[PDB]
Design a protein around this ligand. Structure first.
Ligand SMILES: NC(=[NH2+])NCCC[C@H](N)C(=O)O
Length: 581
């Protein structure tokens, strides 16, 4: 009859192939969508094919009587134990315990838990992007964390991921900095960096000559004089040096050679504007050079002339945005570019990208995705600041996270050696910072809350990290013949075992969603449901105290895969785990 095509597929994908073939065999067109999704309730099975009503409508027939025809052609032997029609023509699919058992075994044998590798793409990820004329702060936090989760996920799926740290390394803010560095290091001659920034502004307002000199040092830097360009590289180098040790504390995969600031695109800008003119897209308007876009309206209600070069001849964010996308396709050969940027930048991005398309700088087959996010708020519902109202240093936020975590872990003692107790607070504190962000739909405005993010109740990092330790504590090496276990089979007999196994095998399709939508909160929700299913499994099914050796070994393997899945999943979020707590 009908056969499988290609290689290894996850359960949802395999079922889709099978249901599609049955639909086609029943008369459905070759572009039919079975819409197989995980069931909401377990009386409805593990999966449901929901695409029947839409298919029946198109062929112009009753879904209830079409579903019975599709059932006739549907072959889930060795995959589904039971398949029945429900309601208006739903297809409830109950997974075969033998099918699940073999895939649990195959997952355990694999270092990546049997997660298939998708067709490899080159993916650029734009995130973090701190202003390097000052110490990194909370305003750059969400982008750094969410973007790095996307990076980790795409890398684990075997993609070529290019981290692009679009740092703000070319503002007027440097004129003051360069002036101060000269007034010291030169004419006068990492711990001074914090004294540096403040002492720079300390003369910005108390010396007319200095603050005038600072404004024209911007010109000299923009002129291309190698003297000021070298002093500029130096203070960027030392700032990124301070930023690296903060990234490290954050457990973020960003390094020095991921830095691609807007200064990198500067020598490209005149070429872009000149080329956009040559294409007849850019024309003069009120002294400025604009591109007219039909998709946008100005304040006058007229078609918007997007400025790519202004009257004084200077460029702006749009021009860099254009050059940036072009560069990422032409030089980096991106198949896909992801921008983790605050949602208020949407229109700016859409404008610049609309020009990118018109010029044909980036083919339409290469998506430019704005993975936008809400802003960090306080309890007041207003932008995030301290007790008074100054911008929050990331280095300070991390400091308090560790200090609060040391106390929170000292609450339940739990008494352990000194070094291990340090690693424990670090995992909990920083884990909480990152997880509290990641566990929420990025698009939503995020309200920072110390009490909730560090609680052992609900979907938080400390809960996840604790649940992981309880999973480990049942797998006691000293009481397990590991060679006998590794050779032992998985035998799924109870509904809770089958539920856990099936959920464990949905690790791949969770990753598939995260990679596609750029939404790590789907991963957070999965792990939490997984931890919950294990608990129900733990409290209802004797593991170490199982009645016989076959069940003991089988349930230990389920526990083993649960541990591996929780640790790998948390790793894709960039969350550290500990052995015990
Ligand atoms: N392509 C860019 N302009 N990237 C910089 C965006 C800034 C950063 N992603 C943020 O919103 O926190």
């Amino acid at each position: 009859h009908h056969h499988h095509h290609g290689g290894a597929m996850n359960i949802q994908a395999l079922l889709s192939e099978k249901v599609r073939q049955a639909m086609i065999a029943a008369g459905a067109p070759a572009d039919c969508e079975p819409q197989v999704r995980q069931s909401a309730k377990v009386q409805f099975g593990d999966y449901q094919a929901n695409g029947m009503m839409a298919v029946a409508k198109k062929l112009g027939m009753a879904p209830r009587q079409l579903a019975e025809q599709v059932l006739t052609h549907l072959d889930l032997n060795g995959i589904a134990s039971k398949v029945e029609i429900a309601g208006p023509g739903f297809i409830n699919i109950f997974l075969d315990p033998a099918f699940l058992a073999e895939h649990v075994q195959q997952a355990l044998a694999s270092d990546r838990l049997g997660v298939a590798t998708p067709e490899k793409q080159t993916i650029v990820v734009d995130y973090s992007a701190p202003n390097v004329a000052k110490e990194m702060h909370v305003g750059h936090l969400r982008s750094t964390i969410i973007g790095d989760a996307a990076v980790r996920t795409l890398e684990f799926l075997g993609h070529k991921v290019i981290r692009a740290n679009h740092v703000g390394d070319w503002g007027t803010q440097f004129g003051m900095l360069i002036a101060w560095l000269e007034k010291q290091q030169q004419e006068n001659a990492l711990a001074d960096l914090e004294g540096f920034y403040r002492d720079a502004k300390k003369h910005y307002d108390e010396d007319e000559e200095f603050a005038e000199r600072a404004r024209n040092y911007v010109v000299k830097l923009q002129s291309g004089d190698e003297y000021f360009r070298e002093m500029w590289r130096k203070l960027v180098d030392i700032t990124m040096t301070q930023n690296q040790i903060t990234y490290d504390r954050l457990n973020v995969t960003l390094t020095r050679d991921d830095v691609m600031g807007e200064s990198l695109y500067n020598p490209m800008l005149p070429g872009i504007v000149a080329d956009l003119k040559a294409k007849g897209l850019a024309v003069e308007s009120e002294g400025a050079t604009v591109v007219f876009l039909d998709e946008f309206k100005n304040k006058e209600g007229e078609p918007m002339g997007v400025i790519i070069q202004k009257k004084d001849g200077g460029y702006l964010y749009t021009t860099t945005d254009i050059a940036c996308a072009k560069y990422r396709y032409e030089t980096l050969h991106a198949d896909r570019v992801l921008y983790y940027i605050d949602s208020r930048q949407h229109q700016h991005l859409m404008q610049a990208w609309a020009i990118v398309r018109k010029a044909g700088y980036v083919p339409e087959s290469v998506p430019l995705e704005h993975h936008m996010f809400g802003m960090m708020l306080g309890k007041d519902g207003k932008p995030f600041k301290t007790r008074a109202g100054g911008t929050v240093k990331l280095a300070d936020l991390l400091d308090e996270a560790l200090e609060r975590a040391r106390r929170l872990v000292a609450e339940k003692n739990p008494d352990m050696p000194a070094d291990e107790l340090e690693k424990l607070a670090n995992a909990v504190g920083i884990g909480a910072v990152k997880y509290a962000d990641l566990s929420k739909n990025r698009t939503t405005d995020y309200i920072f809350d110390w009490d909730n993010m560090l609680a052992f109740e609900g979907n938080t990092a400390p809960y996840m990290q604790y649940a992981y330790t309880r999973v480990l504590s049942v797998f006691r090496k000293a009481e397990i013949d590991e060679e006998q276990l590794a050779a032992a089979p998985v035998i799924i007999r109870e509904d809770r075992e089958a539920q856990l196994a099936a959920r464990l095998l949905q690790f791949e399709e969770t990753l598939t969603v995260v990679a596609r939508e750029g939404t790590p909160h789907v991963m957070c929700a999965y792990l939490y449901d997984l931890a919950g299913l294990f608990s129900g499994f733990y409290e209802h099914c004797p593991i170490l105290s199982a009645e016989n050796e076959e069940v003991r070994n089988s349930r230990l393997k389920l526990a083993q895969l649960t541990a591996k899945t929780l640790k790998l999943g948390l790793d894709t979020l960039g969350i550290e785990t500990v052995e015990r707590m």
